[PDB]
């Protein structure tokens, strides 16, 4: 996260991390059994964390818990990011808590201007690099789908919106996938992609939650 700030110790109780011998890609807990990322993410043996806040340091609070099964969505192309969303399910339930806690999924989309709340690991830095222990956090809206496809011409999908500042300073990074946009109290948005971090011009890209509520279900119910 670039431009953000630190979020507070288990402020965002959904937030996961997925590791495999180190951070790689956020997620989000939906219920006791189920973990959503983004399709770019995934890989075999991920071991999905919970609670956490400084993710080099056992706090107290966290959970670690390996996946039993992954499942990508069908439709996903890995050239073009369309699609990019991901199925986890823990092989035990989480204990859920004030600090490990599902968030729900949409009822139907978010309109553009609607604030939303975005979280990760990633880097903070949109030249060069610096990776925080600790959760960052931003408050950015949801972008007109005109001003997205404008910005990323021939790359933008119905499954996909922008989220951000076309100003730059202040966006999702490197790391940062997989995790959430979430909206009023609704999980919209899955960290997807983009050119360069915090750059004017080129905000982030996120998966469209809202189109897959269906499938998650049915995905989960029979899985
Ligand atoms: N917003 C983003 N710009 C580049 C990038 C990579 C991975 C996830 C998000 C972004
Ligand atoms: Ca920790």
Same mark, same amino acid.
């Given at each position: 996260?670039?431009?953000?700030?630190?979020?507070?110790?288990?402020?965002?109780?959904?937030?996961?991390?997925?590791?495999?011998?180190?951070?790689?890609?956020?997620?989000?807990?939906?219920?006791?059994?189920?973990?959503?990322?983004?399709?770019?993410?995934?890989?075999?043996?991920?071991?999905?964390?919970?609670?956490?806040?400084?993710?080099?340091?056992?706090?107290?609070?966290?959970?670690?818990?390996?996946?039993?099964?992954?499942?990508?969505?069908?439709?996903?192309?890995?050239?073009?990011?369309?699609?990019?969303?991901?199925?986890?399910?823990?092989?035990?339930?989480?204990? &859920?808590?004030?600090?490990? $806690?599902? =968030?729900?999924?949409?009822? !139907? #989309?978010? %309109? +553009?201007?609607?604030?939303?709340?975005? @979280?990760?690991?990633?880097?903070?830095?949109?030249?060069?690099?610096?990776?925080?222990?600790? &959760?960052?956090?931003?408050? $950015?809206? =949801?972008?007109?789908?005109? !001003? #997205?496809? %404008? +910005?990323?011409?021939?790359?933008?999908? @119905?499954?996909?919106?922008?989220?951000?500042?076309?100003?730059?300073?202040?966006?999702?990074?490197?790391?940062?996938?997989?995790?959430?946009?979430?909206?009023?109290?609704?999980?919209?948005?899955?960290?997807?992609?983009?050119?360069?971090?915090?750059?004017?011009?080129?905000?982030?890209?996120?998966?469209?939650?809202?189109?897959?509520?269906?499938?998650?279900?049915?995905?989960?119910?029979?899985?």
């Amino acid at each position: 996260i670039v431009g953000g700030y630190t979020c507070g110790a288990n402020t965002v109780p959904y937030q996961v991390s997925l590791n495999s011998g180190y951070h790689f890609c956020g997620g989000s807990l939906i219920n006791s059994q189920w973990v959503v990322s983004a399709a770019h993410c995934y890989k075999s043996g991920i071991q999905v964390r919970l609670g956490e806040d400084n993710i080099n340091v056992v706090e107290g609070n966290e959970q670690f818990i390996s996946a039993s099964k992954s499942i990508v969505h069908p439709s996903y192309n890995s050239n073009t990011l369309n699609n990019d969303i991901m199925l986890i399910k823990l092989k035990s339930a989480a204990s &859920l808590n004030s600090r490990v $806690a599902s =968030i729900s999924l949409p009822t !139907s #989309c978010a %309109s +553009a201007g609607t604030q939303c709340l975005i @979280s990760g690991w990633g880097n903070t830095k949109s030249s060069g690099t610096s990776y925080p222990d600790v &959760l960052k956090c931003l408050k $950015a809206p =949801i972008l007109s789908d005109s !001003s #997205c496809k %404008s +910005a990323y011409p021939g790359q933008i999908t @119905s499954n996909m919106f922008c989220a951000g500042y076309l100003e730059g300073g202040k966006d999702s990074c490197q790391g940062d996938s997989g995790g959430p946009v979430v909206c009023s109290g609704k999980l919209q948005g899955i960290v997807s992609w983009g050119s360069g971090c915090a750059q004017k011009n080129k905000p982030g890209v996120y998966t469209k939650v809202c189109n897959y509520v269906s499938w998650i279900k049915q995905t989960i119910a029979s899985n």
